[PDB]
């Protein structure tokens, strides 16, 4: 009847109607290949809003055309993108939900034709292009791209920003010593590997005072790589720098074996939560409403992030609320249809 | 593995990918009160298309402003409506589904301010306005409105048209002797009560050669009213007149007791099907994929029409296909998410 999953959650001054969040998931549907928002996105994202998702994070959006994963990604490297994005914001908020955006750079895992960049000139695998080692100029400009992305997102009317430092992409690559072999201030030590992310958090916080997430991969799944222990100092640092919540997933820095099963990334989300004393978001194989409730109720995370579950059902919250016997607001058009 | 629910179904030359159909359900979301298509409709209808519904019938659309149920309904009484509707058609078809529209007149059950019309000047209940008995001129013009609605729907690019003669609305009111007390060619006998619908089917068929549904209420649930027996001659007539399928629901002509339970309108849909030798669509409380499969497999109907089920889940076909272990096409963006 009276559950935690469907309880409000305030981040800074922004209040989410529930703890359900849509994770960023690339839709590869910018057919115009210019980072533009499209018909697809205007159907896809508000559908989850209608289904009572409390916070919807728009897919990894490239801060530069270089930093796209693919050519068919969304972009925010130009003021021309603000209008497309502002409409998307309107269409999602109109139907109840809050909206965020994952500012992203794909680093050495970019599949865009041409030069791709990374902290060190070291490919993802045997089959991947070797990226260009970044100059201090490249670094500064990339931090600047992130700041501009944030400025644009603010102007488009987003409620939340997520700095995307996960899944083997640029920022994640600086953090992991597998990929960061630099011998200047940006590599070589725990504090140095953090600096890139740190300057991005500062750079974004200059132009944006709203709710701020950071996505991480808490484990590299590699003997010589990082583990969730390593992100505890980093999360403590993020807290001081003003990061409000940590979106805790894992993996994808280098090819690796991964044991996948229900809530397999929850203990990462909890370790960072308790040890760094910072709010976290759990993600990855959260099927039922029951399972989400246990996560929140046992202080494992503060928001449950959903992925395929919301691709499989955009109205998953209604399904979960039936399963938990909870009362939630139906759009007025579906009140009688959602017979409680 | 290999099921009937997810088998094609060709009507005239139009082939539906499966037997799933979204029933027309009024959304009361024309806030501009001018019959215009709106943001709401452009999210609502393509969401079900994305979820692999084979045929989506747009809500009861008023052929005149008088024939709206409410002021916030969709309309098709003007050529100005063609553009709004053509876009909606585009947004639904773009994402796989076929699209239809229920041409509607609300008769004496209209709640629009001003004059409402009916075959006889007899209200719905004690609490309802008394309608204006229709002149032969009124009749002709109403048939003409229906024809124009069809012409516009064709021009907007709809694949299917449904003449809405159900749920106690205008055409249904001519058919039922509860509501039709006329003593001219339009009332008094079984053949006379049919004539209004008959002239509408002819009038629509003049301007439209595509797939044509007719919605009926097979039972008035009243001792002196019609029963599904009575719609067998009428369905035989509809067949000759070129009607391709009959959308068989029931009730709502006058206030009445209704026993409601799973597939409670299926035997209506089957009687008309076998006895008139015409394709039918079953509707009303069809929860599972299992239950839909039995209907199709035992020749009870040819398409299952869905209502609240699709308000509760727009991707119900995916749910049903999991339940039946059937292979269906996911939009390319959700292929991996819909892991089969």
From Swiss-Prot, chains A, B:
<feature type="binding site">
    <location>
        <begin position="307"/>
        <end position="308"/>
    </location>
    <ligand>
        <name>FMN</name>
    </ligand>
</feature>
<keyword id="KW-0521">NADP</keyword>
<feature type="binding site">
    <location>
        <begin position="23"/>
        <end position="26"/>
    </location>
    <ligand>
        <name>FMN</name>
    </ligand>
</feature>
<feature type="binding site">
    <location>
        <position position="215"/>
    </location>
    <ligand>
        <name>FMN</name>
    </ligand>
</feature>
<dbReference type="InterPro" id="IPR001155">
    <property type="entry name" value="OxRdtase_FMN_N"/>
</dbReference>
<comment type="subunit">
    <text>Homotetramer.</text>
</comment>
<dbReference type="GO" id="GO:0010181">
    <property type="term" value="F:FMN binding"/>
</dbReference>
<protein>
    <recommendedName>
        <fullName>NADPH dehydrogenase</fullName>
        <ecNumber>1.6.99.1</ecNumber>
    </recommendedName>
</protein>
<dbReference type="Pfam" id="PF00724">
    <property type="entry name" value="Oxidored_FMN"/>
</dbReference>
<feature type="binding site">
    <location>
        <begin position="164"/>
        <end position="167"/>
    </location>
    <ligand>
        <name>substrate</name>
    </ligand>
</feature>
<feature type="binding site">
    <location>
        <position position="28"/>
    </location>
    <ligand>
        <name>substrate</name>
    </ligand>
</feature>
<keyword id="KW-0560">Oxidoreductase</keyword>
<dbReference type="GO" id="GO:0050661">
    <property type="term" value="F:NADP binding"/>
</dbReference>
<dbReference type="GO" id="GO:0003959">
    <property type="term" value="F:NADPH dehydrogenase activity"/>
</dbReference>
<feature type="binding site">
    <location>
        <position position="60"/>
    </location>
    <ligand>
        <name>FMN</name>
    </ligand>
</feature>
<keyword id="KW-0288">FMN</keyword>
<dbReference type="InterPro" id="IPR044152">
    <property type="entry name" value="YqjM-like"/>
</dbReference>
<dbReference type="InterPro" id="IPR023663">
    <property type="entry name" value="NADPH_DH_bac"/>
</dbReference>
<comment type="similarity">
    <text>Belongs to the NADH:flavin oxidoreductase/NADH oxidase family. NamA subfamily.</text>
</comment>
<keyword id="KW-0285">Flavoprotein</keyword>
<feature type="binding site">
    <location>
        <position position="102"/>
    </location>
    <ligand>
        <name>FMN</name>
    </ligand>
</feature>
<comment type="function">
    <text>Catalyzes the reduction of the double bond of an array of alpha,beta-unsaturated aldehydes and ketones. It also reduces the nitro group of nitroester and nitroaromatic compounds. It could have a role in detoxification processes.</text>
</comment>
<dbReference type="InterPro" id="IPR013785">
    <property type="entry name" value="Aldolase_TIM"/>
</dbReference>
<keyword id="KW-0216">Detoxification</keyword>
<dbReference type="GO" id="GO:0009636">
    <property type="term" value="P:response to toxic substance"/>
</dbReference>
